[PDB]
C-alpha cells in the first residue's frame, strides 16, 4: 500500500552536539551510533506540468555493497489528520548502481549534490538522524566539499502505513524529551 512519512525537524549547534548524542544514547535503543556518510543527488523531470517530478538518489559512500536508494516524496497533505508532523507520501526503492545512467535515459536531469555525514539512532519505529550537510563544489568530485552551516540538522522520522494514527503523539513525546537541547517541530516546506 501507500506508506506515509512523518517528519519532525530541527537543528543543533555543534559545540553542544555531544551532549545531544549522549542524551540520545540514553533514550534510544541499546546500540552504538552508526556514523553514516551518504552522497545525495536530486533529479527532476521537466514534464508538461507546472510541477516537475523530483527524485532523490543516495549512494552510501562509507559502506561498500550498500544498494543505491531512490526516494519519491509526495507533497505534504494539507489535511489536519496528524497536526504535528509533516505527513507525506513516501515511495522508497532499493536499486542497482547504474541508476543515474538509467535516470539520464528517463528524462531526468540533476539539480544539486550534497554529502550528508552524521549519526543514526532509532527508538522503536522512530529514526533519529543527526547529520551535517556538506555542499559539493567541483560537481563530479565528492572530496571537494564545504560545510553549509555551523549547525547540524536533526530529523525524527517515522515511515509507516497510510493514515495510522497515534504515531505523531509518540513523536511529540520523544521530541519533548529533548526540548531543552533541541526544538523539533513541524516546519512547512514553503519558504
Amino acid at each position: 500500500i501507500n506508506m506515509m512519512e512523518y517528519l519532525l525537524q530541527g537543528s543543533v549547534l555543534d559545540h553542544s552536539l555531544e551532549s545531544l548524542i549522549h542524551r540520545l544514547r540514553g533514550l534510544c535503543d541499546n546500540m552504538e551510533p552508526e556514523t553514516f556518510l551518504d552522497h545525495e543527488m536530486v533529479f527532476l523531470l521537466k514534464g508538461q506540468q507546472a510541477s516537475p517530478f523530483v527524485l532523490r538518489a543516495r549512494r552510501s559512500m562509507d559502506r561498500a555493497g550498500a544498494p543505491w536508494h531512490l526516494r519519491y516524496l509526495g507533497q505534504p497533505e494539507m489535511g489536519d489528520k496528524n497536526r504535528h508532523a509533516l505527513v507525506r507520501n513516501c515511495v522508497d526503492i532499493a536499486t542497482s548502481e547504474n541508476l543515474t545512467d538509467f535516470l539520464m535515459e528517463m528524462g531526468f536531469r540533476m539539480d544539486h549534490e550534497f554529502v550528508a555525514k552524521g549519526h543514526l539512532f532509532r527508538k522503536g519505529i522512530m529514526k533519529i538522524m543527526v547529520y551535517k550537510i556538506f555542499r559539493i563544489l567541483v560537481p563530479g568530485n565528492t572530496d571537494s566539499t564545504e560545510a553549509l552551516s555551523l549547525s547540524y540538522l536533526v530529523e525524527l522520522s517515522v515511515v509507516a502505513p497510510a493514515g495510522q494514527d497515534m504515531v505523531s503523539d509518540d513523536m511529540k513525546n520523544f521530541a519533548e524529551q529533548l526540548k531543552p537541547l533541541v526544538h523539533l517541530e513541524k516546519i512547512d516546506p514553503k519558504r
Binding site: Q9, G10, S11, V12, L13, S16, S19, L20, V42, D111, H112, E113, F114, I133, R135, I136, L148, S149, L150, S151, L153, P180, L181, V182, H183, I187, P189, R191
Partner: peptide, 24 residues
C-alpha cells in the same frame, strides 16, 4: 541559559535539504 540551537540555522538547513536553496 546558553543557546544550544540557532533557529535561523534551522530554517537555512531545512531550506537547503527541502530544495536547492544554498547548494547550487
Amino acid at each position: 541559559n546558553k543557546q544550544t540551537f540557532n533557529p535561523t540555522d534551522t530554517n537555512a538547513l531545512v531550506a537547503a535539504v527541502a530544495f536547492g536553496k544554498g547548494l547550487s
